[PDB]
Each structure stands twice: as structure tokens, then as C-alpha cells.
Design a protein around this ligand. Structure first.
Ligand SMILES: Cc1cc2nc3c(=O)[nH]c(=O)nc-3n(C[C@H](O)[C@H](O)[C@H](O)COP(=O)(O)O)c2cc1C
Ligand SMILES: [Cl-]
Ligand SMILES: [Cl-]
Ligand SMILES: [Mg+2]
Ligand SMILES: [Mg+2]
Length: 206
């Protein structure tokens, strides 16, 4: 099955298009919380075109060997609106199995109103099955270079808070919070907010 999805808004494209890693957005108000957008890296990772993806739950990547104790942690994150990083067996369009380090995180529209989910997918090679631990080491070292305000803005943002909630928590203006966010993005060479949530969760700070 597949549902017809409205063309994605600019904020959806801004979240994933410039990411170097496979990234997707789902809309939980549509049938089966289906993908509403994928970036180019998702098509090159999986072999699926945007036409084949949009309208479908991302569990189309699952197959015979997929670990239900690890997918349930994603279901849990979707339910509790909390970010989850698991490494699960998935299958490309050509049936090629691959280990997928998948982040699923709650994210808000550019008006901070409605909830969506951001997904991002990194292949862990059969050659080098501990690649995930090397990403977490890199993430932890980068996040340690941040100033104290930048680090705690990053922590609250990656936890899935709207800017208005981060601003409430820290006694700042939304404008000030977005200023600190931008500075983190520039300092750590992060193209998208999705890339920022990924290193936070990799590091263990959210
Ligand atoms: C944004 C997003 C991205 C997802 N990416 C993947 C993925 O790459 N591979 C996968 O097997 N599941 C992925 N999932 C998880 C499934 O869509 C589903 O949430 C999970 O399998 C647990 O639900 P279920 O028990 O109904 O399958 C993603 C979920 C969301 C919301
Ligand atoms: Cl889901
Ligand atoms: Cl302020
Ligand atoms: Mg495209
Ligand atoms: Mg299942």
C-alpha cells in the first residue's frame, strides 16, 4: 500500500536535502506514519526512488532477519517522542542485506506547531561492523569543543524540543536560541538540523 502525500514544504527540504547522509521525514498524521520526503543520499543508499518511498512506512526496508527488539525501540521513541539510534538489518531495493544505523527523532515544522519524525540511515559495512562506535567517538570529541551555552542548546534541541521550549527552559528569546544553534552548525560543519541531532545522539548527549 501507499498514500498520496502533499508536496513537501520548504522546511521539510531544508531539514534533509543538504545532509550527506540518507535522511527522510515522516508525517504521523498520515496513514501508517509514512515518509513524506527522502534526500538524494537515501536513494543512493537503498536504490529506492522518491516515487517508490513517499506514502509508505520506512519499515519497507525491513526483511526476514530484522530485529523486532530493536524496531520496538523505534516504536517506543515514536510513542514517547524521544530520539532513538539502533543498528538493524535492512534490505536494499535489490534485496542486498545491510546493517543500518538508523536515527529516528521527533521534529517540529518551521512554525513549531505540528510534530513530524526525522530519520537518518548510515550503512555499517560487513567489513567494519564497529563503524558505529567510531562515529560515536568522533561525535563526542566534536561536541566537547562547544562552549557551555552551545552545548546545552544542542542537548535540548537534539532531545526534540521546539525553539520556544528551549527558550522557555534557558530563559532566552527564540531569536537567541536560533543564534546559538546557527553558531553550532557553522562550528561543527553541519549542513542540516538532522546532522546536528545525529551527532548529539551518537555522542550520548540526547
Ligand atoms: C522517520 C522514520 C524513519 C525510519 N527509518 C527506518 C529505517 O531506515 N529502517 C527501518 O527498518 N525502520 C525505519 N523506521 C521504523 C519503522 O518505520 C517503524 O517505526 C518501526 O519498524 C517500528 O514500528 P513497527 O513495530 O510497526 O514496525 C523509521 C521510522 C520513522 C518514523
Ligand atoms: Cl511508525
Ligand atoms: Cl535572550
Ligand atoms: Mg530529490
Ligand atoms: Mg514488526
Amino acid at each position: 500500500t501507499r498514500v498520496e502525500v502533499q508536496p513537501p514544504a520548504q522546511w521539510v527540504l531544508d531539514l534533509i536535502e543538504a545532509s550527506p547522509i540518507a535522511s527522510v521525514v515522516s508525517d504521523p498524521r498520515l496513514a501508517d506514519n509514512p515518509l513524506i520526503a527522502i534526500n538524494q543520499a537515501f536513494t543512493d543508499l537503498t536504490g529506492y526512488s522518491e516515487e517508490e518511498c513517499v506514502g509508505r512506512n520506512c519499515r519497507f526496508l525491513a526483511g526476514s532477519g530484522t530485529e523486532p527488539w530493536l524496531t520496538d525501540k523505534i516504536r517506543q521513541g515514536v510513542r514517547e517522542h524521544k530520539p532513538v539510534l539502533v543498528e538493524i538489518l535492512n534490505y536494499k531495493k535489490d534485496g542486498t542485506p545491510f546493517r543500518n544505523a538508523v536515527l529516528v527523532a521527533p521534529i517540529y515544522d518551521d512554525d513549531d506547531e505540528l510534530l513530524y519524525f526525522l530519520g537518518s540511515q548510515v550503512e555499517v559495512d560487513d567489513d567494519q561492523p564497529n563503524m558505529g562506535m567510531a562515529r560515536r567517538e568522533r561525535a563526542a570529541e566534536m561536541l566537547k569543543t562547544l562552549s557551555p551555552r552551545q552545548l546545552e542548546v544542542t542537548t535540548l534541541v537534539a532531545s526534540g524540543l521546539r525553539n520556544k521550549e528551549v527558550a522557555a527552559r534557558l530563559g532566552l528569546s527564540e531569536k537567541t536560541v536560533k543564534m546559538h544553534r546557527g553558531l553550532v552548525m557553522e562550528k561543527l560543519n553541519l549542513k542540516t538540523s538532522a546532522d546536528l541531532v545525529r551527532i548529539a545522539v551518537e555522542a550520548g548527549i540526547a
